């Protein structure tokens, strides 16, 4: 259980697992939706779908190869999967169809067919997926006029004016050897992957990606998208949090785990050791909530999201939740900290030790692109067990107590009160 | 008057009533507020205010 990195001008990372039955090989780039502008937003989402189109997936299926891809704000992925004794064929396909030749993929017929499907994907998302479009709107009001505001799928208006030239320009600027990591997970040995690469030569482009003029900045604000015909209210609320490669990275994750997640219709979720639940269940002000701590290269967010059918008691839900947050500065106990320690270990122990090599490749490539190295799971546990009550109170006194907030909501949100009555609940007065 | 002109009985009864009526005005001010709570307040435009409210 250890990763091995080498460099030849090309970075090559690998987590070998001898007891698996598959192998994944791919390339991860260090540019995401936070590396484009409002005019070409969605060009990366359209690159993913050109990779996964028919005539490229057909050519892989005849050889016994499956394909995958993912767009995020800091990185992109293009992965190939196979049986363990078929990994050299995986690398060849990744060489031919992607890095060297792509005139086959950017044809006039394949481009229009791909654009039609992607527009239908995005239009469907904006009309039916309410919890996820409110979290995207939160990012856009918190980081307005800054690169961390742009949605990852793109916007239906900017996505309509794209041509092949926009794709080719974006490729020449960001798909570069200086901005790339080659990964390998599952039943694959490091030496074999290194040997297969030097037998070929395998370089995409040289480097010099553009530098981004503006840095990300948090701004307290709100955006309300009112729709009285929907049957619920969906709300998300956050403060500024921690970026990746921060000293307070695990302390913010432990603090989110203290308040946790809830489903009203599951019996065992009603019995969790969370003091907020003693307040909501007597009048049943929500159906579910979840606390998050999101982290990027430049900034982060810390907060919660909720959905509810009780549209006359929204003000009681927001009030009781924000008063529990205040206790992290004043009166958090030792039992609440020892519970969140061991449940945080179970959480990220399941994220980093699933059975899917595709998830391993995305995690590994994103971490090595920032830190140059991966922190093992035995090391992360020791940092978590060394946190005390004093560290939590010091973090909360700086990040939560009387600080500005960002809010987004949709649906039946008449009962959501104004900004300054919610902002005033971030301090107590009775300390 | 209490007599045949404005005199002593007039001035002593006018002071006892003058202390009383302020407490009757206060009871009418409570009934006045109850009638406002039903429909709330109007606004300078003369149209409905149920679409945009502030606490
Ligand atoms: C001791 C005397 C009074 C007190 C304490 C009082 C109190 C109030 C208060 C607090 C309001 C709330 C809205 C506003 O300020 O406009 C109000 C509204 C109102 N008052 Fe009075 N009031 C008094 C006398 C009167 C009188 C003498 C009249 C008329 C002859 C009157 C007619 C009204 C009306 C029509 C409104 C509603 C106005 C609107 O909503 O557009 N009140 N009153
Ligand atoms: C048919 C047979 C009949 C024979 C018997 C004869 C008896 C006849 C008289 C019966 C007695 C009257 C009935 C009792 C009654 O209406 O009041 C007693 C109940 C309590 O009064 P309340 O109206 O709830 O308080 C009044 C409240 O409901 C209203 O509150 P509000 O004052 O509008 O708020 C303003 C406060 C704002 O706060 C501040 C000032 O900052």
TrEMBL record, chain B:
Compartments where found:
Mitochondrion inner membrane
Give the residue spans that cross the bilayer. Answer: 16-38
For heme b b562, which residues are the binding ones?
A: 18
Q: Cite the binding residues for a ubiquinone.
A: 37
**Which residues bind heme b b566 per the record?**
32
Family, per the entry?
Answer: Belongs to the cytochrome b family.
Q: What does this protein do?
A: Component of the ubiquinol-cytochrome c reductase complex (complex III or cytochrome b-c1 complex) that is part of the mitochondrial respiratory chain. The b-c1 complex mediates electron transfer from ubiquinol to cytochrome c. Contributes to the generation of a proton gradient across the mitochondrial membrane that is then used for ATP synthesis.
| Name of the protein | Cytochrome b
């Amino acid at each position: 259980a250890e990763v091995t990195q080498l460099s030849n001008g090309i970075v090559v990372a690998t987590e070998h697992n001898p007891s698996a039955h598959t192998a994944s090989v791919g390339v991860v780039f260090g540019s995401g939706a936070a590396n484009e502008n409002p005019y070409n937003n969605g060009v990366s989402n359209l690159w993913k779908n050109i990779f996964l189109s028919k005539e490229n997936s057909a050519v892989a299926a005849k050889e016994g190869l499956a394909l995958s891809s993912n767009i995020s704000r800091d990185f992109q992925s293009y992965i190939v999967s196979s049986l363990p004794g078929s990994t050299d064929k995986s690398l060849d396909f990744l060489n031919q169809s992607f890095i060297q030749q792509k005139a086959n993929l950017l044809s006039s017929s394949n481009f229009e067919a791909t654009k039609k499907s992607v527009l239908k994907q995005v239009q469907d998302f904006e009309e039916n997926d309410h919890p996820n479009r409110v979290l995207e709107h939160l990012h856009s009001t918190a980081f307005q006029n800054t690169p961390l505001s742009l949605p990852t799928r793109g916007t239906l208006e900017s996505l309509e004016n794209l041509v092949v030239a926009d794709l080719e320009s974006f490729a020449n600027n960001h798909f570069l050897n200086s901005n790339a990591v080659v990964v390998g997970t599952g039943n694959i040995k490091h030496e074999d992957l290194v040997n297969s690469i030097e037998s070929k030569n395998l370089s995409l482009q040289t480097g010099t990606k553009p530098v981004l003029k503006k840095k990300a900045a948090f701004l307290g604000s709100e955006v309300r998208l009112r729709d009285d015909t929907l049957p619920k209210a969906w709300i998300s609320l956050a403060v500024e949090g921690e970026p990746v490669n921060s000293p307070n990275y695990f302390v913010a994750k432990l603090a989110a785990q203290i308040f946790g997640s809830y489903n009203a219709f599951e019996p065992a979720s009603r019995l969790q050791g969370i003091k907020l639940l003693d307040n909501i269940q007597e009048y049943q002000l929500c159906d579910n909530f979840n606390h998050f701590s999101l982290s990027y290269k430049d900034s982060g967010l810390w907060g919660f999201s909720t959905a509810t059918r009780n549209v006359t008691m929204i003000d009681d839900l927001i009030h009781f939740t924000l008063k529990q947050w205040n206790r992290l500065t004043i009166s958090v106990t030792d039992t609440e900290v020892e519970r969140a320690k061991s449940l945080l270990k179970l959480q990220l122990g399941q994220l980093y030790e699933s059975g899917n090599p595709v998830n391993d490749a995305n995690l590994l490539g994103a971490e090595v692109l920032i830190k140059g190295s991966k922190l093992s799971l035995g090391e992360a546990f020791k940092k978590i067990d060394a946190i005390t009550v004093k560290d939590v109170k010091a973090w909360a006194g700086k990040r939560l107590w009387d600080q500005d907030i960002a809010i987004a909501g949709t649906g039946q949100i008449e009962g959501l009160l104004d900004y300054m009555r919610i902002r005033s609940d971030m301090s107590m007065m009775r300390w | 008057w209490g007599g045949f002109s404005v005199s002593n009985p007039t001035i002593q009864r006018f002071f006892a009533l003058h202390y009383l009526v302020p407490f009757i005005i206060a009871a009418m001010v409570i009934m006045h507020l109850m009638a406002l709570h039903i429909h709330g307040s109007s606004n300078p435009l003369g149209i409905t205010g149920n679409l945009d409210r502030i606490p």
